[PDB]
Q: What sequence folds into this?
């Protein structure tokens, strides 16, 4: 995670508890592959973490 | 069920199917809708988040939108593995919690 934005999004994503491992790994892979997408990746991950809480309450 | 979904439907492969849901001002009217897919004999999983954002790994044959107290899910190029129970989920400001539809079954003929 070479730049400040990558590093910041990385730690936010590592700490999103409602993501499954594949989801989490896919977001961190995106941060590495497409550093310019760091802000969009982090926003998508925060949304998905919130949505995954609805899925938990449905089961 | 707090949200009312459209009736279960049968469609042929490659057809386009639209499922819909109606709520109130306190849920769909003020919050984004999530869609859950419950494959036959399997635990439910997230398909769509925040009205229109695909969950990771979900085919772009799925699309979603929301308008007023209504939301919809559209499946393009319907394929036998899409046969499932589809559930709308949203935050309700009045319940201060998640509300769900009763589910819509899509049967692929």
A:
């Amino acid at each position: 995670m070479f730049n400040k934005d990558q590093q910041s999004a990385f730690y936010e994503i590592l700490n999103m508890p409602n993501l499954n491992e594949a989801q989490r790994n896919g977001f961190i892979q995106s941060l590495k592959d497409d550093p310019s997408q760091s802000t969009n990746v982090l926003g998508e991950a925060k949304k998905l973490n919130k949505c995954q809480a609805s899925l938990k309450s449905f089961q | 069920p707090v949200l009312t979904q459209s009736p279960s439907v049968s469609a042929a492969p490659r057809q386009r199917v639209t499922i819909s849901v109606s709520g109130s001002n306190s849920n769909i009217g003020s919050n984004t809708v999530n869609w859950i897919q419950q494959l036959p004999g399997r635990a439910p999983e997230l398909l769509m988040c925040d009205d229109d954002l695909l969950a990771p790994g979900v085919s772009d044959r799925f699309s979603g939108s929301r308008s007023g107290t209504s939301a919809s899910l559209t499946i393009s190029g319907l394929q036998s593995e899409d046969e499932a129970d589809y559930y709308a989920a949203t935050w309700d400001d009045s319940l201060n919690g998640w509300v769900f539809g009763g589910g819509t079954k899509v049967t692929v003929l």
